[PDB]
Structure 1
Amino acid sequence: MAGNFANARVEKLIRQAGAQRVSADAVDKMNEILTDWGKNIAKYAVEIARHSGRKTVKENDIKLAAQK
């Protein structure tokens, strides 16, 4: 519920940033920080989609929500 993404994908991201070693707690904390920040953008994008008069969230509503 706190980490929505797969741990192996969040770990690959921290290793491509240059991390020589990555603690499983750091993978769990990065998963939580990506999930929380993603839920915030998606919640605001859903309100932009409905203000625009549509049920579907589309690329422009994610792009505009991220620029807030």
Structure 2
Amino acid sequence: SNAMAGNFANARVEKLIRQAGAQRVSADAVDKMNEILTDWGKNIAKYAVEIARHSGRKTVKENDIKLAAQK
């Protein structure tokens, strides 16, 4: 569902909320968490791609992701 807004599988975002200690989880909470992870992940990935390319490279590497998350 809403594949542009939530990138990840719903069954995996639900597993994450239930391992955080949830006794029950609403389907709307799984969709909201999926959207919040996707928006935040997209911000880090966009900045890591600019760091890769400033470095002089086509390939995104572990160090570019690590530096972009620290911003």
- TM-score band by shorter chain is over 0.9
Which residue is equivalent to 1:18?
21
Q: How far apart in 1 are the matches of 2:50 and 2:62?
A: 14
> What's the TM-score, normalizing by structure 2?
0.95
- Equivalent residues, number: 68
C-alpha separation in 2, matches of 1:20 and 1:63: 33
Q: Which runs of 5+ in 1 are unaligned?
A: none
- CA deviations on 1:11-65 (whole Å, 9 max, x unpaired) are 0000000010000000000000000000000000000000000000000000000
RMSD: 0.3
Once residues 33 and 56 of structure 2 are traced to their aligned partners in structure 1, the CA distance between those partners, rounded to angstroms, is: 35
Query: What's the % identity of the aligned pairs?
Result: 100
Could you list the structure 1 runs, at least 4 aligned residues long, displaced by more than 6 angstroms after superposition.
none
Q: TM-score, normalised by structure 1?
A: 0.99
